[PDB]
């Protein structure tokens, strides 16, 4: 078993974390367990504070910050967990003083936007930062020599049981009925659309347009909704004034073509990595009390132009490892 | 002074 | 004898927050310490591993 | 499910060639296609690789100046145009697949077509 | 990054412990895979990652990592494992393979 670690400049304190990928189960988020090794040679008026910051960038704004005092340990505190904070303490059996945090169940996941032609040090998005620093008091200024900062992210995977089969139909009017293969799709799976356009009018369908669209609601941006097409399909299929057309199509979203677009959401990046399109956000029971970050959803579109359109929702996320 | 690279150790 | 105790009431409110440096020696003068009450035969305890007591 | 390489050649030193690799069973955006080259009696030397989801390609040092890799998204096939020389005129070129997301190890392999 | 592997090793028909090591010249964070190539056939992936098996591989095969040192182990050698094994690292873009250790029957 391997464990991640990081140290401050001047080598005074060091922070250990077992992973920087915390799965957010739909019922309870995973906890963050870390161990701090420090040497109090003359730390008479010095205390160790470990913080967990969830911030939204553009200047930045945070809605969940916390502070945990590791040394001197607070009396009547909780027991450390045996998964990490027992083996780590056994290895550093001299001054290993642990810390722990718990994440509220309704915090947004780590999703970053695509910057495009301009760089601002770090791209827009939501990121979780773990900052551990020694200081005389919590309210006083601390400089980079005394602070350890490590970036983590929160993710969630696909549900085990698939949902109902998506389908949507609309309307001597013409009738169009569409369907997908299944409810949940992965990041490389081809999204097939079943199409049937029975006609009774004299207006013939000229061109069938199908696209996959990514919806990213930003609550902090005055509840703005930005949608972009991540897939495009154009087969130029026409039907007779009053005929019956049934066909299967195929689409596959990918980042290579969408790199040109700006403001498009991507998965959490540790440092300037390449990541897939942002996964869907699973909201617990529809209680939309989260007002911090961004939520991503995907809906397929099927459009017909005469000489009407239906939208089919689905989810796009990785399977459980 | 700048931060050092994130490393890894055994358990 | 020799014993020391300090006032503290953050945890274990059942018996704590007594005056420090009393003539009556503390019930336990290390990681945990115990001491008697102000005017009764009751003993109160509180952890003391943070720093050496000042009494 | 499986990979089949339909390529092959017999080239005088300093010409051109073309390798094709048909793949049936998995999509080309959910997987990464690599070409591995084994000289007779020598180890497996890595050659051009393509990640169609991101669109960029890596090249070996000995092939960076001559080889060119491409993929056909319409039929799930990988193309490896060559301008081979004497040093590469004895090897057997494989076509193996790795998972696109969170893996780079190669799980499915082709039979391999000799190039000379 | 030069990945080095131990030379060919003998073996016995009856199952016995066989350890094959691959010494990485540069540190790789447990991103190492092991293969098996019988003569005249394509290599077969054996290990997903150091100490992690792959779907369909029997339970005898095992792996381990000791810092920059990796190891492949077989708990019991039946006459079907007599092939050659390659150690590969997939951390850096210039992917390299080991020289390959050929197991033989005595």
Which 3 state secondary structure label does DSSP give A284?
Answer: coil
Token pair 């704004």: residue:
A61
Q: Positive or negative, the Cα torsion across D51, D52, D57, D59?
A: positive
Residue E27 CB burial class (10 angstroms; 0-12, 13-18, ≥19)? exposed
Whether E54 sits inside 8 A of D107 (CB atoms) is yes
Measured distance CA(D89)–CA(D115) in Å, rounded: 6
Measured distance CA(C16)–CA(B6) in Å, rounded: 46
- Residue A227, annotated as binding a ligand: yes
A237 in the same domain as A139: no
Q: Which residues contact A179 (CB under 8 A, 6 or more apart)?
A: A165, A166, A167, A193, A194, A312
Return the CA Rg of chain C: 10
- The DSSP 8-state label assigned to residue A107 in this structure reads P
Q: Which residues contact A93 (CB under 8 A, 6 or more apart)?
A: none
Residue D101, Cα to own-chain centre: how many angstroms? 19
Residue A256, in any domain of the structure: yes
Query: Which residues make beta-bridge pairs with E32?
Result: E89
A178 in the same domain as A122: no
Torsion of CA A108, A113, A118, A123, to 10 degrees: 40
- Residue A303, annotated as binding a ligand: yes
Residue A162, in any domain of the structure: no
Q: Which two tokens stand for residue E17?
A: 């412990």
Resolution of this deposited model, Å: 3.3
Which 3 state secondary structure label does DSSP give A49?
Answer: strand
Task: Please give the method by which this entry was determined.
Answer: cryo-EM
Residue A74, in any domain of the structure: yes
Select from D2, D110, D22, D17 the least CA-distant residue to D74: D22
Select from A165, A155, A147 the least CA-distant residue to A103: A155
Q: Which two tokens stand for residue C24?
A: 């009556």
A223 in the same domain as A97: no
Query: Do chains D and B meet with 3 or more Cβ pairs nearer than 8 Å?
Result: no
Measured distance CA(A211)–CA(A233) in Å, rounded: 6
Which 3 state secondary structure label does DSSP give D76?
Answer: coil
Q: Which two tokens stand for residue A37?
A: 């090794």
Which 3 state secondary structure label does DSSP give A52?
Answer: strand
Q: How many CA atoms lie less than 13 Å away from E41 in the CB half-sphere?
A: 12
With CA atoms as reference, the chain A residue closest to D29 would be A188
- What string of DSSP letters covers C2-43? --------SS-TTS--PPSS-SSPPSB---EEEEE-SSSS-E
The domain defined by D2-115 carries CATH number 3.30.300.90: no
Q: How many CA atoms lie less than 13 Å away from A228 in the CB half-sphere?
A: 20
Give the residue numbers spanning the domain of A9.
Answer: 4-155
D61 lies within 8 A of chain E by CB: yes
Q: What is the 3-state secondary structure (H, E, C) of E31-97?
A: CEEEEEECCCCCCEECEEECCEECCCCCCCEEEEEECCEEEEEECCCCCCCCCEEEEEECCCCCCEE
Whether A76 sits inside 8 A of C50 (CB atoms) is no
Where would I find the H helices in chain B? Answer: none
- In chain D, domain spans: 2-115
The beta-strand segments (E) located in D1-116 are 2-5, 17-24, 31-38, 44-50, 57-58, 68-72, 77-82, 92-99, 106-109, 113-114
A123 in the same domain as A79: yes
Q: Which two tokens stand for residue C16?
A: 């704590």
Q: Which two tokens stand for residue D90?
A: 């004895």
With CA atoms as reference, the chain A residue closest to C10 would be A75
Q: Which residues contact A173 (CB under 8 A, 6 or more apart)?
A: A200, A201
Contacts of A44-49 with C-beta under 8 Å, sequence gap 24+, read: A45/A136, A46/A134, A46/A135, A46/A136, A47/A71, A47/A72, A47/A134, A47/A135, A47/A136, A47/A137, A48/A13, A48/A97, A48/A132, A48/A133, A48/A134, A49/A132, A49/A133, A49/A134, A49/A135, A49/A138
Residue A110, in any domain of the structure: yes
Measured distance CA(A189)–CA(A298) in Å, rounded: 14
Nearest CB among A188, A259, A321 relative to D100 is that of: A188
Q: What is the CATH number of domain E3-105?
A: 2.60.40.10
Distances (CA, A) of C22 to A87, A88, A298, B4, B7: 43, 42, 72, 52, 53
C52 lies within 8 A of chain A by CB: no
Angle at C40 between CA C36 and CA C43, to 5 degrees: 30
Which 3 state secondary structure label does DSSP give A4?
Answer: strand
Residue pair C21/C48 in contact (Cβ under 8 Å)? The answer is no
Select from A149, A139, A58, A103 the least CA-distant residue to A290: A103
The total of other beta-carbon atoms located within 10 Å of residue E36's CB is 19
The total of other beta-carbon atoms located within 10 Å of residue D83's CB is 15
Residue A321, in any domain of the structure: no
Angle at A254 between CA A263 and CA A308, to 5 degrees: 80
φ, ψ (nearest 5 deg) of residue A88: -65, -40
Residue at a domain's end among A128, A155, A182:
A155
Q: Is the peptide bond before A278 cis (omega within 30 degrees of 0)?
A: no
Measured distance CA(E81)–CA(D21) in Å, rounded: 29
Interface contacts A/B by beta carbons within 8 Å: 40
Mind listing the domains of chain C with CATH numbers?
A: 1-50 (2.30.30)
A196 in the same domain as A126: no
Tally the domains of chain A.
2
Measured distance CA(A136)–CA(A43) in Å, rounded: 9
A88 in the same domain as A183: no
Contacts of B4 in chain A (CB under 8 A): 6-7, 9
> Terminus-to-terminus CA distance in chain A, angstroms?
17
Domain of A282, CATH number, reads 2.60.40.640
Residue A290, Cα to own-chain centre: how many angstroms? 14
Select from A112, A139, A145, A142 the least CA-distant residue to A127: A112
Residue pair D97/D3 in contact (Cβ under 8 Å)? The answer is yes
Interface contacts A/C by beta carbons within 8 Å: 11
Which 3 state secondary structure label does DSSP give A258?
Answer: helix
């Amino acid at each position: 078993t391997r464990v991640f670690k990081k140290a401050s400049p001047n080598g005074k304190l060091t922070v250990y974390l077992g992973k920087r990928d915390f799965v957010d189960h739909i019922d309870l988020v995973d906890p963050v367990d870390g161990v701090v090794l420090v040497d109090p040679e003359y730390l008479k008026e010095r205390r160790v504070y470990v913080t967990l910051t969830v911030a939204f960038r553009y200047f930045r704004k945070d809605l969940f910050v916390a502070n945990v005092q590791s040394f001197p340990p607070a009396p009547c505190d909780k027991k450390p967990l045996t998964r990490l904070q027992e083996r780590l303490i056994k290895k550093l059996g001299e001054h290993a003083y642990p810390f722990t945090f718990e994440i509220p169940p309704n915090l947004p996941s780590s999703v970053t936007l695509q910057p495009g032609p301009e760089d601002t040090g770090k791209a827009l998005g939501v990121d979780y930062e773990v900052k551990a620093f020694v200081a005389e008091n919590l309210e006083e200024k601390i400089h980079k020599r005394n602070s350890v900062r490590l970036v983590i992210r929160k993710v969630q995977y696909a549900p085990e049981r698939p949902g109902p089969q998506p389908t949507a139909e609309t309307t001597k009017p013409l009738h169009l009925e569409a369907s997908l293969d299944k409810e949940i799709y992965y990041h490389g799976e081809p999204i097939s659309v079943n199409v049937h356009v029975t006609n009774n009018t004299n207006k013939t369908v000229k061109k069938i347009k199908i696209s996959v669209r990514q919806y990213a609601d930003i609550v902090l941006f005055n509840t703005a909704q930005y949608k972009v097409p991540v897939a495009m399909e154009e087969a130029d299929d026409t039907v007779a004034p009053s005929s019956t057309f049934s066909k299967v199509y195929t689409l596959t979203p990918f980042l290579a073509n969408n790199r040109e677009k700006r403001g498009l959401a991507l998965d959490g990046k540790l440092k300037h990595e390449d990541t897939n399109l942002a996964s869907s956000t699973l909201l617990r029971e529809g209680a939309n009390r989260e007002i911090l970050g961004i939520i991503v959803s995907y809906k397929v579109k099927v459009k017909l132009v005469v000489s009407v359109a239906v939208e089919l929702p689905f989810t796009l996320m990785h399977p459980k490892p | 002074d700048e931060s050092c690279t994130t490393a890894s150790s055994s358990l | 004898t020799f014993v020391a105790l300090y006032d503290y009431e953050s945890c274990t409110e059942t018996d704590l927050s007594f005056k420090k440096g009393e003539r009556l020696q503390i019930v336990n003068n290390g990681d945990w310490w115990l001491a008697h009450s102000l005017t009764t035969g009751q003993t109160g305890y509180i952890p003391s591993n943070y720093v050496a007591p000042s009494d | 499910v499986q990979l089949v390489e339909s390529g092959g050649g017999l080239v005088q030193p300093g010409g051109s060639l073309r390798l094709s690799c048909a793949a049936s069973g998995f999509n080309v955006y959910s997987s990464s296609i690599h070409w591995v080259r084994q000289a007779p009696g020598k180890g497996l030397e890595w050659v051009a690789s393509i990640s169609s989801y991101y669109g960029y390609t890596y090249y070996a040092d000995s092939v960076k100046g001559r080889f060119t890799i491409s993929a056909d998204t319409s039929k799930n096939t990988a193309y490896l145009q060559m301008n081979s020389l004497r040093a590469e005129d004895t090897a057997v070129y494989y076509c193996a697949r790795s998972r696109q997301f969170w893996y780079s190890g190669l799980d499915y392999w082709g039979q391999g077509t000799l190039v000379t | 990054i030069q990945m080095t592997q131990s030379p060919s090793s003998l073996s016995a028909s009856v199952g016995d412990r066989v350890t094959i090591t691959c010494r990485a010249s540069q540190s790789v964070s447990s991103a190492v895979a092991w293969y098996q190539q019988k003569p005249g056939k394509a290599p077969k992936l054996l290990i997903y990652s150091a100490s992690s098996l792959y779907s369909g591989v029997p339970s005898r095969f095992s792996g381990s990592r000791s810092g920059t040192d990796f190891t492949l182990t077989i708990s019991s050698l039946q006459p079907e494992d007599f092939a050659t094994y390659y150690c590969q690292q997939y951390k850096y873009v210039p992917v390299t393979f080991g020289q390959g250790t050929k197991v033989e029957i005595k």
